[PDB]
């Protein structure tokens, strides 16, 4: 039986939202994705006999732990917790602004929410319903079974009921990292990490890599070397991973899939046996290649190239489809891969495993359950872990000697560096690096601060600016 080997690799990450001075989490994104996706995404492995793999950034692990110990001073979460009689006019306007942001998402389809947003002024019981429905909207698959009566109520929520939800949600956060241990040890999946604060490792090692694919861009003058800090990102990522899982990682997901000959060298020197990247990178690097192979980079490291169209379909396309149609198309694509090649192909599906489901019907539960049950049924599809794909001798291997430096965003670094706006943050970083004293300069090297710079007016940009300028200034003291 000729087989298609399928590898799913969900990448979980949130940048550090904890402002160093006040210690307050300025954005509740870590919390809301932790109750909705971070626990429940690996939890499918208990219900379905398939293999699934997960990447966890160390910075996200720090924030998950802080909430699980009851230490995060989350300013928005404190507003939900409060009795509505306590809320200031600015706390209420914040709770409305958040609801307006998520209004069109299918996980906010409540008839009550439709009514509050059309109301003029909200009373204490109406604010209670708004506080509580904002919590229930981000209910993961596990708790959507336990809070069926609360979710069926839809309206008229009391303060003790709202507290009951919050207690269930925090129990989920305390459970999150354990279920990653459990699935790793029972062999249902592999777990990788990324460099600590999710930086663009290629730019840190050699900023001239931006010119491999875009030879005319104007990047700032790098009067300091980011080469040791890039080593710290890997070196500390391995120790944080050691803390949770009790062993060094050998698999790593490069942030934003960014690779280079210099970065692939650095990963190998840190004991990384395997990493993956985009197949657009493969097209730029090798001549007439197929992403369905295992690749030996210079006989040092193993590289895999994700099937870009398949991963893009899940992350950006299937949300507007019926679940049955989405899975049927997906399997139909896999069938065409199985016949287009003369060998047993491997298909890597890598994408962010938290951000696409809020736009899905029922938070992607029908699609995910339909897909996982379907893959279980298909005899010819064998889902693998990262370790299994490493040992798999049915997969054809080829050697390559170089790669073009780029990311899974068009194969270049234009989304983070380039024009004057993206470059202003880098100049701020370099001058801070010049006078840097502590490791907060590592936090300022995260890709997320340079992604959100001035491309198009986006939600809570003022917060990402306030946070990046905070770490930069904290690193100089």
Decide if 245 contacts 454 (C-beta within 8 A).
Answer: no
Q: How many CA atoms lie within 13 A of 286 on its CB side?
A: 18
Which residues fall within 8 angstroms of residue 295, CB to CB, at 6 or more apart?
302, 303, 304, 305, 397, 398, 399, 400
SS3 231: helix
Decide if 7 contacts 15 (C-beta within 8 A).
Answer: no
Give the Cα-Cα-Cα angle 214, 306, 14 (nearest 5 degrees): 80
Taking residue 298's Cβ as centre, other Cβ atoms within 10 Å add up to 14
Structure determination technique employed: X-ray
Note the maximum CA span of the chain.
68
- CA neighbor of 266 nearest in space, from 328, 331, 348, 204: 204
Using CB atoms within 10 Å of the CB of residue 273, give its burial: 0 to 12 exposed, 13 to 18 middle, 19+ buried.
middle
* Tokens encoding 139: 């209910």
Decide if 115 contacts 145 (C-beta within 8 A).
Answer: no
DSSP β-bridge partners for residue 6? 347, 383
Q: How far is CA 174 from CA 64, 184, 189, 329, in A?
A: 8, 18, 20, 37
Decide if 411 contacts 213 (C-beta within 8 A).
Answer: yes
Backbone φ and ψ for 145, nearest 5 degrees, come out as -85, -30
How far from each other are the two terminal CA atoms of the chain, in whole angstroms? Answer: 63
Which residues fall within 8 angstroms of residue 408, CB to CB, at 6 or more apart?
256, 257, 258, 277, 278, 280, 281, 306, 308
DSSP β-bridge partners for residue 333? none
Decide if 372 contacts 6 (C-beta within 8 A).
Answer: no
Burial 185-202 (b: 16+ CB within 10 A, else e): eeebbbbbbbbbbbbbbb
User: E-assigned strands of 13-164?
Assistant: 24-25, 53-56, 73-74
Cα–Cα dist 79/90, whole Å: 10
* Tokens encoding 310: 């398949």
- CA neighbor of 361 nearest in space, from 326, 332, 331: 326
Cα 466 off chain centre by = 22
Q: How many CA atoms lie within 13 A of 29 on its CB side?
A: 18
Q: Helix, strand, coil shares of the chain as percentages rounded to 5?
A: 55, 10, 35
- CA neighbor of 476 nearest in space, from 438, 445, 449: 438
Cα–Cα dist 69/243, whole Å: 16
Q: How far is CA 22 from CA 93, 276, 440, 476, in A?
A: 22, 38, 15, 17
Give the Cα-Cα-Cα angle 414, 467, 36 (nearest 5 degrees): 85
SS3 74: strand
Burial 354-388 (b: 16+ CB within 10 A, else e): bbbbbbbbbbbbbbbbbbbebbeeeeebbbbbbbb
Backbone φ and ψ for 209, nearest 5 degrees, come out as -70, -15
Q: What is the DSSP track for 347-393?
A: EEEEEESSSSGGGSGGGGHHHHHHHHHHHHH-TTEEE--HHHHHH-T
Q: What is the DSSP track for 130-172?
A: HHHHHHHTT--HHHHHHTHHHHHH-S---HHHHHHHHHHHHHH
Domain limits of the chain? 24-38+63-181
Decide if 34 contacts 375 (C-beta within 8 A).
Answer: no
Cα–Cα dist 264/402, whole Å: 9
* Tokens encoding 200: 């663009």
Q: Give break positions in the chain: residue before each, C–N beyond 2.5 Å.
A: none
Backbone φ and ψ for 351, nearest 5 degrees, come out as -170, 165
- CA neighbor of 244 nearest in space, from 408, 61, 117: 61
- CA neighbor of 75 nearest in space, from 110, 29, 132: 29
| Helical H segments across 290-364, by residue range | 308-312, 323-340
- CA neighbor of 385 nearest in space, from 34, 42, 2, 14: 42
Cα–Cα dist 393/397, whole Å: 9
Which residues fall within 8 angstroms of residue 266, CB to CB, at 6 or more apart?
201, 205, 230, 231, 234
The single residue listed with the structure tokens 């396309």 is 317
CA quadruple 287, 289, 293, 294: dihedral, nearest 10: 20
Cα–Cα dist 198/191, whole Å: 16
């Amino acid at each position: 039986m000729k087989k298609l080997f399928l590898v799913f690799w969900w990448h979980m990450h949130q940048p550090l939202y904890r402002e160093p001075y006040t210690g307050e989490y300025l954005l509740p994104w870590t919390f809301f994705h932790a109750v909705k996706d971070y626990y429940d995404m690996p939890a499918y492995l208990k219900d379905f006999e398939i293999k699934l793999n997960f990447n966890l950034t160390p910075v996200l692990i720090d924030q998950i732990q802080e909430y699980a110990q009851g230490k995060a001073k989350d300013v928005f979460l404190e507003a939900i917790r409060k009795d509505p009689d306590d809320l200031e006019k600015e706390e209420v306007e914040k709770l409305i602004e958040f609801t307006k942001l998520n209004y069109e998402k299918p996980i906010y389809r409540f008839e009550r929410i439709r009514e509050l947003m059309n109301k003029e002024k909200l009373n204490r019981e109406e604010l209670l319903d708004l506080q509580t429905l904002n919590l229930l909207a981000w209910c993961g698959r596990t708790l959507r079974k336990d809070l069926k009566d609360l979710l069926n109520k839809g309206r008229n929520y009391t303060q003790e009921e709202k507290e009951y939800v919050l207690n269930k949600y925090f129990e989920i956060i305390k459970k999150t990292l354990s279920i990653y241990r459990e699935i790793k040890e029972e062999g249902k999946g592999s777990v990788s990490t990324s460099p600590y604060y999710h930086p663009l490792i290629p730019i840190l090692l050699n900023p001239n890599c931006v010119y491999e694919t875009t030879p005319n861009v104007k990047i700032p003058d790098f009067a300091v070397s980011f080469r040791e800090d890039a080593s710290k990102h890997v070196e500390l990522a391995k120790e944080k991973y050691f803390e949770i899982f009790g062993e060094h990682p050998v698999y790593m997901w490069p942030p934003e899939a960014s690779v280079s000959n210099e970065a692939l060298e650095l990963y190998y020197e840190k004991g990384i046996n395997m990493l993956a990247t985009d197949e657009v990178i493969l097209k730029n690097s090798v001549e007439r290649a197929s992403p369905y192979l295992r690749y030996y980079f210079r006989e040092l490291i193993s590289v895999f190239f994700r099937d870009k169209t398949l991963s893009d379909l899940i992350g950006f396309s299937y949300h507007a489809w019926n679940a049955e149609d989405a899975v049927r198309d997906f399997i139909g694509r896999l069938k065409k891969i199985h016949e287009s090649v003369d060998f047993q192909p491997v298909v890597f599906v890598v994408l962010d495993g938290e951000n696409c489901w809020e736009y899905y019907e029922e938070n992607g539960i029908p699609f995910l359950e339909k897909l996982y049950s379907t893959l279980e049924k298909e005899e010819w599809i064998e889902t693998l872990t990262l370790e299994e794909a490493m040992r798999k001798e049915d997969v054809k291997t080829e050697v390559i000697e170089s790669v073009k430096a780029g990311t899974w965003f068009d194969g270049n670094f234009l989304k983070w560096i380039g024009n004057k706006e993206k470059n202003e943050y880098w100049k701020i970083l370099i001058e801070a690096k010049k006078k840097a004293k502590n490791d907060y300069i590592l936090v300022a090297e995260g890709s997320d601060w340079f992604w959100w710079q001035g491309e198009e007016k986006a939600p809570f940009v003022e917060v990402f600016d306030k946070l990046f300028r905070s770490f930069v200034r904290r690193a100089q003291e």
